[PDB]
């Protein structure tokens, strides 16, 4: 948990800089998409080298993921999995043409990963450098080792309802900067701008989770600096 004041010097993009549709498809997808949410899956199946196809996961009929590179595929292919990340079917190709959504990431080994109790993360939120409270059972998760996707997905659609984040000016959306951090005790903290995504649809606003990274759940909180400049 850092000074607002210093956060403030980072080059935080600002939500006046997003061109046409982005603002409204980062809402679309931290509010209204749809998301994976399965356990006890497995796939050995692809379609690209980099990628596991998930071959009728849904009862769309097909999930296709996408990972950073055939290393990572190699650790969840044939194995137990758990899903949770969000899909999109813009753009989506690799498996039952017509009928294939895409995903980035999302994916945890399911053996040995369910917490004593579900986790509650705690978040520290500050807006221009005010601290607000903000419930417990925001953000909570059952595995013991979560991939930052599931633990933002929550997050962010939190920033949505209280703070209308991804809304227009006019619409009440006074947010124009932040900052999200997931701050680990053991491992690197990642950090992302709430407005830093690239490109204006699913199929590349979601590729920040395409590394699938991974972090301890326990001992460790999200700290969330907001600005309305």
Not at 9 to 25: C, F, I, P, V, Y
Not at 96 to 125: F, Q, S
Not at 159 to 164: A, F, G, P
Request: charge should be neutral; aromatic fraction near 12%; hydrophobic fraction near 30%.
């Amino acid at each position: 948990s850092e000074k607002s004041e210093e956060i403030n010097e980072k080059d935080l993009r600002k939500k006046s800089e997003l061109q046409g549709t982005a603002l409204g498809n980062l809402k679309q997808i931290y509010y209204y998409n749809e998301k994976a949410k399965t356990e006890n899956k497995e796939s050995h199946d692809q379609f690209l080298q980099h990628t596991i196809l998930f071959k009728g996961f849904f009862t769309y009929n097909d999930l296709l993921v996408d990972f950073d590179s055939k290393d990572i595929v190699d650790k969840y292919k044939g194995k137990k999995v758990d899903l949770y990340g969000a899909y999109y079917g813009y753009q989506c190709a690799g498996g039952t043409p017509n009928k294939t959504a895409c995903m980035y990431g999302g994916v945890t080994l399911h053996d040995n990963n369910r917490l004593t109790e579900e986790k509650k993360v705690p978040i520290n939120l500050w807006l221009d450098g005010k601290q607000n409270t903000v419930p417990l059972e925001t953000v909570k998760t059952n595995k013991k080792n979560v991939t930052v996707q599931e633990l933002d997905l929550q997050a962010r659609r939190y920033l949505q309802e209280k703070y209308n984040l991804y809304n227009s000016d006019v619409f009440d959306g006074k947010v124009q900067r932040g900052l999200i951090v997931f701050h680990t005790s053991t491992e690197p903290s990642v950090n992302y701008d709430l407005f830093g995504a690239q490109g204006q649809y699913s199929n590349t606003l979601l590729r920040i989770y395409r590394d699938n990274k991974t972090i301890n759940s326990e001992n460790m909180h999200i700290d969330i600096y907001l600005y309305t400049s």
